[PDB]
Design a protein around this ligand. Structure first.
Ligand SMILES: *[C@@H]1O[C@H](CO)[C@@H](O[C@@H]2O[C@H](CO)[C@@H](O)[C@H](O)[C@H]2NC(C)=O)[C@H](O)[C@H]1NC(C)=O
Lengths: 48, 49
């Protein structure tokens, strides 16, 4: 990791830094669970 | 850290940021020189005996 961060095959003694640490997400989620207020189309399409 | 500050938690800037190449790897070398040099100043003020 520190070899390819410095773009070299050799490293000298010392302290270095690399790509920062991060916890990746795992799943995916959604919203708007309750849906109501359906449009009154039945009487339009099924009136006697 | 250049990656998180600009386009953290993003998989779309990750590849896109490489299009600019060698910007944010240049900044780290600039600040790392300052931080390393900071300890030297305290060395020159107390470590005389
Ligand atoms: C309509 O919205 C309400 C607002 O939360 C929902 O009420 C609760 O929903 C949770 C999760 O769906 C249930 O565990 C609870 O039992 C619900 N409360 C009651 C008093 O039953 C409600 O579920 C939504 N309607 C539908 C059909 O999901």
């Amino acid at each position: 990791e520190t070899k390819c961060t410095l773009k070299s095959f050799t490293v000298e003694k010392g302290i270095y830094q690399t790509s920062n640490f991060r916890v990746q997400p795992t799943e995916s989620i959604v919203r708007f669970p309750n849906i109501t207020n359906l449009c009154p189309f039945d009487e339009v399409f099924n009136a006697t | 850290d250049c990656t998180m500050y600009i386009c953290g938690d993003s998989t779309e800037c990750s590849n896109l940021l490489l299009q600019y190449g060698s910007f944010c790897t240049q900044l780290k070398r600039a600040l790392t020189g300052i931080a390393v040099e900071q300890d030297k100043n305290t060395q020159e003020v107390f470590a005389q005996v």
